[PDB]
Amino acid sequence: GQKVHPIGMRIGVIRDWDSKWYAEKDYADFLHEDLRIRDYVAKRLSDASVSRVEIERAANRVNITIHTAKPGMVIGKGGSEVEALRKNLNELTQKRVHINIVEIKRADLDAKLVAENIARQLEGRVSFRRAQKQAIQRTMRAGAKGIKTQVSGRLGGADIARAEHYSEGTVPLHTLRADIDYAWEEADTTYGKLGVKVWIYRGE
RNA sequence: GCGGGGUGGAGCAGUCUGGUAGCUCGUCGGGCUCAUAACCCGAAGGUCGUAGGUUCAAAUCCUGCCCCCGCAAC
RNA sequence: GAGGUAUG
RNA sequence: GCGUAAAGCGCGCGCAGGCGGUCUUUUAAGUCUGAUGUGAAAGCCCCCGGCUUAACCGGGGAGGGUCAUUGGAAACUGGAAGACUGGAGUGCAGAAGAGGAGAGUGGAAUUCCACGUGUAGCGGUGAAAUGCGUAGAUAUGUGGAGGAACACCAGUGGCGAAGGCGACUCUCUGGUCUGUAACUGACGCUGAGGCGCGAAAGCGUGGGGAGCAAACAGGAUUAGAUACCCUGGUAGUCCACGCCGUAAACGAUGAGUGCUAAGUGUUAGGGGGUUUCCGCCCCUUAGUGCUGCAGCUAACGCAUUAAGCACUCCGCCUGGGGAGUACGACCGCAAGGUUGAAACUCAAAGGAAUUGACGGGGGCCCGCACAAGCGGUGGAGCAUGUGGUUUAAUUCGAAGCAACGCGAAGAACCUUACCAGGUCUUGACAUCCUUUGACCACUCUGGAGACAGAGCUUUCCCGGGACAAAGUGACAGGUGGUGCAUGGUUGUCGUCAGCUCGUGUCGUGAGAUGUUGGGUUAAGUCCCGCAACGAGCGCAACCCUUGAUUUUAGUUGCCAGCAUUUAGUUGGGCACUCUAAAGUGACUGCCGGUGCAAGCCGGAGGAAGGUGGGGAUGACGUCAAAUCAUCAUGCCCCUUAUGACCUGGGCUACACACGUGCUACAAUGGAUAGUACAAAGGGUCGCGAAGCCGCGAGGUGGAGCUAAUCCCAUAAAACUAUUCUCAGUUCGGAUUGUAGGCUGCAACUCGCCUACAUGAAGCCGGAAUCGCUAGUAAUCGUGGAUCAGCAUGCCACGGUGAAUACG
């Protein structure tokens, strides 16, 4: 069959939407502003392990919280990275900006991060067995009560495609008391695109 | 030259007894079926070889021609 | 458990 | 190697040959052994040497014979002379038997003949019909004729070499088993080549011929039916004699001997213990069957009736097909049989077993699947979509369920990708370089416009920043392709209850187990049991909504107790609603019955009872299902054009077919008037009030409202009155003409709505076919999105409100 996006199934249930504001007459403007913002962030901070972005609006200021595993790149030895960010984001938004940077602990408990790991591996021509399995073991060591992954594409350069999925632990997608994380990431290959999907069942 | 004939696409009636378009197969359409066939439901398709006559009216009665199948002639 | 009495 | 894969003659009688019980003596045919002689050289093999090594060459040795002669051994085979008995056979005492041939005999029972009674059918099928029958059946009784086979007994029971043999009696005959140890003393096992027997069909001659019955005839069936099916019916079937000599002739398993656990029937015998025989028990022989240990087997399975362990003998196999054919021979009256190839061709053929799928196989369970019912489609008109067609173009995609009111939640231009025309090429759209800086905006002219000519006029801001004109190549761009390279998204089986896995165990193994079974449940839900124990995905539940209620808060909502207003109005108050946060409650939780238990049925309380109702929620995977036209995307292709702009056109065509819907075909109705009760929703340059003008569509106007305040917004069906009186109608409302209104630059192609007139088809829908089990179907209006305008479509809303479920 076809599965529902297990995040979308849980918005307004146990997860809060990431784009947080109220608006009227300003809604589309703020939305597409913040989509441009996420494009900027993903474009210039894919390397930095950026994995979640929550937006906030009040008093015209563009408040942001970037949850990342390595802060030391978003900030760090210079102190000028976040200032560059708010400068260019001022140029876009035509507003004020402020940017908190949160440290994620257990970076292998975020499906987005894990999917980027696997995707960079598969672009570097690593085996799609070892990739999935090592990501799984890293999660279950990092503290996941459940893990699941799959890859679909021209696996290994085939003509015909298929899917390879592997799971440890309890991963119930029909339960909603589940705190599940999910992600989909894309890898490029000289043969074509590979779709990596991940989802994690977490502690409490 | 002598016999048969020429009527929807095919085969056959109906002509002798002027008004009557028929039987079987087929065709087209719609159903049944995953699709074709079969089956069920409806419909179309012939101015009766042709040109003239007679008649109120001709597939039908009269005449000439043109074709096909046989038989003769060659 | 055994023996018999239309098509693709 | 021969049960099932190729392979046991169909079975016997038996010449030849092969093989042969125990012991003593004799030999030395075979066997074994010492000696001598030879088996040439070259070559293989080993050891040395020589050619620059190697190849090659030389020297020497060794090996090699079912070799021969001579001399020795007697264990085994063989020959010879004796002896013995467990084999083999005769005798003796018993027992069974459908063993065979002949002759005769019995009664059931089918048919036929005659005669009574006797009246209109009988027969047969899925329905029939052909056929028999008033010239008298069918049936019923009596009597008679003729033939064929022999119920019960009768049984994986008997016998036989096999084929096969069933009514009884007699005659003539064969073989088997049991006991004895009398008799002979290995006389035996097999058995090529021969000889005979040998189901049924069939052949020749002559009888018989009742039934059944190939062929055949007629009737049905069918698309056709040279068939199944029906009614008739010749050969035959039966006998005598003689041929034929085949078989799924099968236990698909050659004859013989011995050995290697058991349990149990059954047949024919014997022996013994006990007991009044009877009866029970045990031991044993030859059969016949069931189940099973070892062992064998690819497995299935065989298993003292081996497919085990061993020996003798025979027959047969060597991939499938051609081919059991051809030539040839033998046999045969013939039909044909026995023996038995090749060329050529294939890359497999095949056996057993496993997993599924399927089944005009079975069983159990479920779903609007049927059935029961309600209302519909197919018929008419229109809207929409699709096909075919015609078109300059009629963009592209979707195609059984799972395409076709689908992408499109809006085709006038734009959209729009297509067509015609007119144009541009670093471009309509981005980065990097170089020059410059506001770029531009508005007017005029030629224009269909894009676009060209001019003008007026471009203020960049503090080297930097942001955007901009021109050069300039790198690049751009492609709704160009491939959804059979892809991602992601989606339907679908199916919200069906199933799909799997770790460890363990069984199996050579694939695979199985678990996951089956007995119950139960909506559910691989849950219990009991089990070589499995457990887990994961799913199911359920957690979520939202509806259904009752407590506390909080009472305005923009409510109005009871109160006054008062045209108005719940104003004051006042949250009583009650309403709103919406946190709680409660419904969990088989309790009682009765039954179950062992899970659970099932009933009962109570309560608003709600049995996952309360409804949602979302869609497992591994199937259809290489759809999507390169949402997006991204590998490869390929175009890149002064498959790219880009503008105008106009087409996507709305029209002989015709399908789907989906709207409108109706009327009296449970229509026209006219009055008139009660909704929910869910939307609104800022948007909703748009009141009042007014206009028949009306609408115009005017601008109140109030960024909204529980105000508006969109009379809700319509319902009800009440009057009329129409069952009619192609005051039904129906198309189509067309004229005139209006909106929207938008613009309404011909090609919008919607109004007024007047016209008044079309249609008087309940062929074969077929669809939704629905409850506030559902049906029916009525409302709202929202998209949207300037453009809906019978889509998604939500409430109003009214059924029928039925045997199964």
Ligand SMILES: [K+]
């Ligand atoms: K005969």
Ligand SMILES: [K+]
């Ligand atoms: K037999």
Ligand SMILES: [Mg+2]
């Ligand atoms: Mg006539």
Ligand SMILES: [Mg+2]
């Ligand atoms: Mg078939």
Ligand SMILES: [Mg+2]
């Ligand atoms: Mg065989």
Ligand SMILES: [Mg+2]
């Ligand atoms: Mg020599």
Ligand SMILES: [Mg+2]
């Ligand atoms: Mg015979």
Ligand SMILES: [Mg+2]
């Ligand atoms: Mg029904």
Ligand SMILES: [Mg+2]
């Ligand atoms: Mg219709």
Ligand SMILES: [Mg+2]
């Ligand atoms: Mg099309």
Ligand SMILES: [Mg+2]
């Ligand atoms: Mg596909």
Ligand SMILES: [Mg+2]
């Ligand atoms: Mg396609």
Ligand SMILES: [Mg+2]
């Ligand atoms: Mg569920």
Ligand SMILES: [Mg+2]
């Ligand atoms: Mg396909």
Ligand SMILES: [Mg+2]
């Ligand atoms: Mg269209």
Ligand SMILES: [Mg+2]
């Ligand atoms: Mg029922």
